[PDB]
Design an enzyme around this catalytic site. Structure first.
Site, mmCIF file in Angstrom:
data_model
loop_
_atom_site.group_PDB
_atom_site.id
_atom_site.type_symbol
_atom_site.label_atom_id
_atom_site.label_comp_id
_atom_site.label_asym_id
_atom_site.label_seq_id
_atom_site.Cartn_x
_atom_site.Cartn_y
_atom_site.Cartn_z
ATOM 1 N N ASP A 1 -12.039 23.662 -37.270
ATOM 2 C CA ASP A 1 -11.388 22.937 -36.369
ATOM 3 C C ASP A 1 -10.951 21.534 -37.202
ATOM 4 O OD1 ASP A 1 -10.184 21.416 -34.053
ATOM 5 O OD2 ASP A 1 -11.979 21.803 -32.846
ATOM 6 N N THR A 2 -11.782 20.446 -36.787
ATOM 7 C CA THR A 2 -11.201 19.340 -37.538
ATOM 8 C C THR A 2 -11.660 19.258 -39.262
ATOM 9 O OG1 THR A 2 -13.405 18.167 -37.160
ATOM 10 C CG2 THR A 2 -11.673 17.966 -35.345
ATOM 11 N N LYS B 1 -7.888 26.569 -36.948
ATOM 12 C CA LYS B 1 -7.365 26.133 -35.540
ATOM 13 C C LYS B 1 -6.151 25.284 -36.130
ATOM 14 C CE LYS B 1 -9.609 25.439 -32.045
ATOM 15 N NZ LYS B 1 -10.522 24.893 -31.026
ATOM 16 N N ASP C 1 -18.156 32.085 -28.662
ATOM 17 C CA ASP C 1 -18.872 31.963 -27.044
ATOM 18 C C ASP C 1 -18.440 30.573 -26.522
ATOM 19 O OD1 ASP C 1 -21.095 30.485 -28.713
ATOM 20 O OD2 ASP C 1 -21.334 30.342 -26.733
HETATM 21 N N1 5GP Z 1 -16.183 29.247 -29.697
HETATM 22 C C1 5GP Z 1 -15.659 28.340 -30.278
HETATM 23 N N2 5GP Z 1 -16.037 27.529 -31.228
HETATM 24 C C2 5GP Z 1 -15.101 26.744 -31.786
HETATM 25 C C3 5GP Z 1 -13.951 26.505 -31.467
HETATM 26 N N3 5GP Z 1 -13.374 25.454 -32.293
HETATM 27 C C4 5GP Z 1 -14.481 25.270 -33.368
HETATM 28 N N4 5GP Z 1 -15.527 25.707 -32.826
HETATM 29 C C5 5GP Z 1 -16.945 25.309 -33.462
HETATM 30 O O1 5GP Z 1 -16.832 24.071 -34.061
HETATM 31 C C6 5GP Z 1 -16.942 24.022 -35.683
HETATM 32 C C7 5GP Z 1 -15.782 23.469 -36.151
HETATM 33 O O2 5GP Z 1 -15.458 22.037 -36.026
HETATM 34 P P1 5GP Z 1 -15.081 21.198 -37.080
HETATM 35 O O3 5GP Z 1 -16.158 20.469 -37.862
HETATM 36 O O4 5GP Z 1 -14.044 21.969 -38.018
HETATM 37 O O5 5GP Z 1 -14.289 20.132 -36.179
HETATM 38 C C8 5GP Z 1 -17.556 25.288 -35.848
HETATM 39 O O6 5GP Z 1 -18.828 25.246 -35.612
HETATM 40 C C9 5GP Z 1 -16.805 26.233 -34.886
HETATM 41 O O7 5GP Z 1 -17.511 27.495 -34.586
HETATM 42 C C10 5GP Z 1 -13.395 27.331 -30.462
HETATM 43 O O8 5GP Z 1 -12.150 27.131 -30.141
HETATM 44 N N5 5GP Z 1 -14.226 28.214 -30.055
#
Ligand code: 5GP
Lengths: 164, 164
Positions: B91-92, B119, B148
Site C-alpha cells: 500500500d504506502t 495498490k 481478509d
Molecule cells: N486485506 C487487505 N490488506 C491490506 C490492504 N491494503 C493494505 N493491506 C495490508 O497493509 C500492509 C501494507 O501496507 P503499507 O505498509 O504498504 O501501507 C500489508 O500488511 C497489507 O497486507 C487491502 O486493501 N486489503
C-alpha cells in the site's frame, strides 16, 4: 519423478479428500470463530488448501515446536491444530498437553496423514484425518526431502536408494 | 461473496499470473537454493500456489510482523543466501520498506520482493523496489484469495473490492 517409487494418492484424490474434510469441519466450527493453528513449517500446503474451503470467520495462528508460541490467548477458545503427518505421536502428545493447560473451550486435531506404524507410542486422539499412509518416506504435496519434492502434486513414496 | 462490490480478478486470471511469475522466478532462482520468505498470513495462499510451480530446491521461511514489530522472526540465518520476500499487497510501502531495511542488515547475497498486488495510490511514501508483481490494484479495500477483513473473506477464489 524418477526418485519416486510409487504414488499413494493423486491430486484428484487430495482435492476430493480436502473438500470432504472442509465440510466436516464446517459442521462443527462454522459458528465458533475457532483459532486454526498451523504447525509450521510442514502443514502449510494442507492448511491453506483447507482454508480455501472454510466459508466462515476464523483466526489463524502458527506454532513451531516451543520456539514460537501462539499470538492468540486460546483460553475459552475453540481450537483446531492442523498438522501434516503423525508418526509416533510424540510431538502431538506434548503439543496437546501443553495447549490443554491453557484452558481452551475445545481442542481437536486435524492431520493430512497418519503414518501406519501399527500401535503408536502415544495415545493421541485424531479427530480429522485425511489419509492413512504406509510407514515409508512420504514425499510430495508439501512433504520434502532435502528441500526438494514439495511441488509434486501427489503424495508418494521416495525410493530408498535416494536417501540411504 | 455478496459483500463484493466487484471482482477484479477471477481464479483463472490469478492462476495464469502465478504460472507466469513462477516461470520468471525459476529463471533467476533455479540454481540458487534461495530462502523464500512468506509474510503471514495474507500472502500464504499466493505463496503456496507459487511453490507448487517451483521445481527446484528452495528453503521456506516465515515472518509475522506489522508496522515495525516482528512477532515471529526467521528461523534461517540469511547471511550469504539469496532471499525472496513474498508479500500480499504493498500500500504506502511502509511495511516493506522497514522489512527490507531489517533484512538487508543480515547480509543476504541478494534480496528481492515478490508481491501479489501493488495498490496504485500514486506516489508512495516509500520507494520500495518491487521486482515481481502479480497485479496493480486500484485504491480500494481489497478482499479475497488470502485478503481478509475482520478475519473473513480469505477463502474467496477471487480478488475483489469490499463493499462500502
Ligand atoms: N486485506 C487487505 N490488506 C491490506 C490492504 N491494503 C493494505 N493491506 C495490508 O497493509 C500492509 C501494507 O501496507 P503499507 O505498509 O504498504 O501501507 C500489508 O500488511 C497489507 O497486507 C487491502 O486493501 N486489503
Amino acid at each position: 519423478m524418477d526418485d519416486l517409487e510409487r504414488v499413494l494418492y493423486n491430486q484428484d484424490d487430495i482435492q476430493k479428500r480436502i473438500r470432504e474434510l472442509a465440510a466436516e469441519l464446517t459442521e462443527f466450527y462454522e459458528d465458533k470463530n475457532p483459532v486454526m493453528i498451523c504447525v509450521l513449517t510442514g502443514a502449510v500446503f494442507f492448511y491453506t488448501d483447507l482454508l480455501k474451503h472454510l466459508d466462515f470467520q476464523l483466526e489463524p495462528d502458527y506454532i513451531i515446536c516451543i520456539s514460537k508460541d501462539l499470538k492468540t490467548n486460546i483460553e475459552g477458545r475453540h481450537v483446531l491444530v492442523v498438522e501434516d503427518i503423525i508418526d509416533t505421536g510424540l510431538t502431538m502428545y506434548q503439543l496437546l498437553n501443553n495447549l490443554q493447560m491453557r484452558k481452551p473451550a475445545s481442542l481437536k486435531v486435524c492431520t493430512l496423514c497418519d503414518k501406519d506404524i501399527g500401535k503408536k507410542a502415544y495415545d493421541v486422539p485424531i479427530d480429522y484425518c485425511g489419509f492413512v499412509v504406509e510407514n515409508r518416506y512420504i514425499i510430495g504435496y508439501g512433504f520434502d526431502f532435502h528441500n526438494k519434492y514439495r511441488n509434486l502434486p501427489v503424495i508418494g513414496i521416495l525410493k530408498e536408494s535416494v536417501y540411504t
